[PDB]
Amino acid sequence: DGLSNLARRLRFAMKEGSIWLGEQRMILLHTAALGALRKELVDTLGMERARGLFMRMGFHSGVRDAELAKTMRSGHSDFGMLEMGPCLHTIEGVVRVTPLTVDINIAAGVYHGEFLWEDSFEGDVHRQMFGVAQAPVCWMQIGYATGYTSALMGKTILYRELECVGCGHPHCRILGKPLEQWEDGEAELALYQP
Amino acid sequence: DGLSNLARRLRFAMKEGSIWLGEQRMILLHTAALGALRKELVDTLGMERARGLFMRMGFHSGVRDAELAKTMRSGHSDFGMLEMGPCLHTIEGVVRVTPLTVDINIAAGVYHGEFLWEDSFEGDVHRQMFGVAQAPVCWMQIGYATGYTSALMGKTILYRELECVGCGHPHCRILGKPLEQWEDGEAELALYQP
């Protein structure tokens, strides 16, 4: 339902060498090319700084997709709106998202959400350039979730991967909740600032 | 046409969370997300070093697309081969490309090429992140032209932007020729190196 409905917002305007998702102009980019940039940033600026750059990039993506979701608001419950994030992330070929348990009420500022990530392009590309890492690696993907749901909730919602293929697990798994639920919350919120 | 023949190689598996162009996995990325990262890379690394990173990302992309083009080469001429570059760049929503004059013989190592760029995304995004620039800004677009043509020729063929929207012009225009056939060429080459 969501996928096939949000997918109609994706448009290819070749007369103008352009691709549009709702109101945001998009490009098709090779994962290997974005992987090479990551290798460069990590090799020179260091892993933890490269991780902030990517999380932040993903954040900005997430916020934009939330604004598109807001326009198609009417007729959707709070879960329906939230769902659109996982849907656009999947359409964008970033990851296959399966929403498991989602507790949301925007009016009350309620949010607790856990999702499954399959075929994460990011974990799958960090490994090709860096082998297995001893910490979750889908930086840009976590950034997106955080930005989207934060835009949607109108308060800081932070996400973390509980499991990542970049660490050598069968899947990535993530959890998102208010900044008051996270033990290292202020340290996590810091990463999203230039 | 090039765009129709090359469209058959773009596979959207929305029920997979993936996108493939030939045998390269792609993502759809918000140009505004790329702009954000560009701003942080300039602000902290400086214009020139940021530029190197984007040109090299473009280069990786153009090289992968030339591999795709070399697959479909049954009865296509050298120009037909070359023309797949500009086509792919368009399909990817990067720019609207119009070849102006192009002399190419792959066997003979000859290449002289001139191209019109309309609605270049990169010049658009730069302008919104930094204002008008005091030199050509379509870095990844250029890297791409270089990388693709070079892989197709088996010979280093560099491009430069002769005119560009990011600088105040109504469009971008570019020149591609042999490496050493450039004055500071040996210096342009240095930017395609980590």
Ligand SMILES: Cc1cc(C)cc(O)c1
């Ligand atoms: C907005 C969003 C939310 C979740 C849980 C995953 C994703 O890929 C995107």
Ligand SMILES: Cc1cc(C)cc(O)c1
């Ligand atoms: C390989 C290539 C060549 C030209 C002229 C434009 C472009 O966007 C890519």
Ligand SMILES: [Zn+2]
């Ligand atoms: Zn992961």
Ligand SMILES: [Zn+2]
């Ligand atoms: Zn330009």
